[PDB]
Design a protein around this ligand. Structure first.
Ligand code: NA
Ligand code: NA
Ligand code: NA
Ligand code: NA
Lengths: 82, 82, 82, 82
């Protein structure tokens, strides 16, 4: 699967995660984007996290949808530049 | 090993982790499920975590039982859909 | 490299991490063991973390020594049982 | 790609992350180094994290630049010594 296709999937995941967190949890766009990266990279600082049942479910789906996508994208990125 | 077999193993891990956290730590079913995903994906926000010696041991076993299972499942999921 | 050799390396890493955290940071043996697993699996809840400069350095070495060892051990464990 | 080349890339990532966190977030050099390792290993305790919009953006770039680099370095390190 081409690296650029994976990148597009990662972009869609970022949109999904950011919009989801902002509207379900009510955080700013900037915090939501930052939380999305932190979550899909599996860093998970816990400075931000869902506080509602829907936010928690949503976060599980994001984890399922995003962690593999992101992992493959970074390693393809690594190959590409190096 | 077939992707669906791995999925079943991941499901059993989720049951194990959720029930374990709920009964050992006393959190709600919903929090326990969410904590299980967050732990086996290695996100680990720390909004929830074990507060007893048995919960801590249990979490170590979950980590050992769940992180590999979950990693293989997501990457097999990725292959399957893409 | 044989799976059992890797297991022994993981055991040594666990001893290293546990003893280190207990004596440098002053946490209980049980907390230190739990923190070691949580760190080398990269879960990192942040319920426990080093609060001194030596603890922070030590944690960086543990991260370097432990995360690869642990990752290979779990995947070898997965292959072995499945 | 030679292991030593990867090591150099990891070193540059560490400089990038440490200096960035220290100057953008204002933490000590020691905390910033420790935070950099904790972030690029994806441990993410959350004892330290960015509190400004620029720090959050910067952390996303560090995550993108550092997690793949670091993962490949540790596994190459593992092969080399074992
Ligand atoms: Na974390
Ligand atoms: Na945390
Ligand atoms: Na992680
Ligand atoms: Na983590």
């Amino acid at each position: 699967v081409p690296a650029t296709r994976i990148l597009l999937l990662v972009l869609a995941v970022i949109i999904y995660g950011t919009a989801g967190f902002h509207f379900i949890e009510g955080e700013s766009w900037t915090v939501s984007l930052y939380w999305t990266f932190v979550t899909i990279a599996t860093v998970g600082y816990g400075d931000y996290s869902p506080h509602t049942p829907l936010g928690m479910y949503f976060t599980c789906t994001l984890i399922v949808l995003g962690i593999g996508t992101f992992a493959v994208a970074v390693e393809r990125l690594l190959e590409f530049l190096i």
